[PDB]
Design a protein around this ligand. Sequence first.
Ligand SMILES: COc1ccc2c(c1)cc(C(=O)OCc1cc3ccccc3o1)n2CC(=O)O
Ligand SMILES: COc1ccc2c(c1)cc(C(=O)OCc1cc3ccccc3o1)n2CC(=O)O
Lengths: 298, 277
Amino acid sequence: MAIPAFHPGELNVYSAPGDVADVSRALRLTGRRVMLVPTMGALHEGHLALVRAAKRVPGSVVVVSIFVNPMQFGAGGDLDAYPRTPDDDLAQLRAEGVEIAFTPTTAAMYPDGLRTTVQPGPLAAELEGGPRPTHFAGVLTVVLKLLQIVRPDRVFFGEKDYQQLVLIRQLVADFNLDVAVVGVPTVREADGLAMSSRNRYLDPAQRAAAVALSAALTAAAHAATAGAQAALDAARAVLDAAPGVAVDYLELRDIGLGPMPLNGSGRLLVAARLGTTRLLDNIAIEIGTFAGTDRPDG
Amino acid sequence: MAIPAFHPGELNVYSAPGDVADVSRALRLTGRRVMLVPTMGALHEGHLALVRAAKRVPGSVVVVSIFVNPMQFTPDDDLAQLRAEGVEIAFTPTTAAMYPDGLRTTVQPGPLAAELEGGPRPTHFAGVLTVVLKLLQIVRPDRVFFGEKDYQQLVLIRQLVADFNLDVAVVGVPTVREADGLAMSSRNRYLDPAQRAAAVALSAALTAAAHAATAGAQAALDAARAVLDAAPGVAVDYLELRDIGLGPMPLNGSGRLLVAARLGTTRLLDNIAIEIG
Ligand SMILES: COc1ccc2c(c1)cc(C(=O)OCc1cc3ccccc3o1)n2CC(=O)O
Ligand SMILES: COc1ccc2c(c1)cc(C(=O)OCc1cc3ccccc3o1)n2CC(=O)O
């Protein structure tokens, strides 16, 4: 009762929040499980893995949102006119059998400018948040809004942007949101580079050196049998051997981004600049007496 | 795993957020409309009026949450009143249940929160909006009911709902008043009989202003000031005429006149609808 056109088995594209909210609600009433994949477009194989994870849930209908949230741009930073490929985007979604694309305007998302917003916890001031102190407020505000509009049963995020994922789990816990946050392992290029829409920014020399991030992390994960100092120093030596790579941070944390014990299990996160382009990556890691395995570590 | 225990036409009291969310989901699916009445307990005729408004919605089940929110500003007596009112659900969470991770992700209100009541208390409304978002997420009501007495708060809640695209109706219920017109409040018990007699000046100023308003905005404001000037011991923090969303009052039209004042140590608030000329 009030439903926009909806063609099942087809990609249906809605800009109006109200429209996708009424479609999502009707679909929920028929007992389909609504899955949300929030994106900023320029879709790559990583996003497709998110869509495929969502597709695997029985009864799933998949909503992919595409919205370049200005409240996570720019000055300073981040300073890029973000890649926009709306045509290819929807043709990828079609091929994958996604039924809903939500592509709102800025005016429909922010009809009152920045008025009520989400204040993230103090994790948002660390790491990615240090130099850009309101960035995560912008992520968590738009993600809360997407969740209220679409009301999915689960929402799917890549693990690459690991701080953002943790903060979104924080959001969902803290506001009692009735949604499951699904983190999906990072899709990588063949040489190990974490997929990102911003990888296309890299010139040839830079694309070649950028392999050092994933090579560092992988080297660290295997060095870690010998402890956290070995893991870190192995990662930093790889990073230092790559020309044109400038390290922002290289840090060990627990899975929730608290302190890492030595001899435990956690995450190693890295951010670096190549010319003007910032890259992130992270890996699961186990250190010391926690890194023993049947065979060779780890 | 079973839907938790719900006994229709009795008062069902849940302390676990999970419990209430489950029960409310179940009923929304068995064809009830879920109504939420958020309270801090110490219930009075004012809250019962919120209760009665909710009850009247056909097919309603009424959820009355009772939570004293540390981030903001008598158990078995409250539950008595609700049972007597035919309230089917009371939600009575603990602080640890509401805040297991302490103060982490919170709501940041827009600039309205730094004004009027937010001048004395600049983080009051952040706590209010945060708990209200949480209660709305836990109960998912069709409609949420608030008194108009805390009008700035009501307006902020409507900002929350619009801004976070919450799909709930916010229902403001006209302020219940004592026979002399004093807006009902918990704080009215504080008042010695002199403060209590002097307290009538707030509602009297506002209704005099409402009626003076046929002669314009200055007439309305001057009438309210005269009435307040006639009261001893009433320290007026503000008296402001605004539009109904608490922006600038238009030239003429519909607005809201708001007052706050201190009597000894009790801070009292009131507001009224005003139609200019
Ligand atoms: C699982 O394999 C991968 C590997 C890398 C991945 C993904 C999947 C997905 C992304 C991604 O960013 O999506 C865009 C986005 C949506 C969004 C919504 C709210 C806030 C921030 C947001 O950022 N990326 C990184 C990238 O494209 O640079
Ligand atoms: C329309 O008739 C009236 C008249 C006066 C009224 C009410 C109704 C309601 C209240 C009231 O405060 O309820 C408690 C409350 C709970 C809560 C939870 C989260 C946020 C804010 C919140 O405020 N009062 C004033 C009072 O009793 O202090």
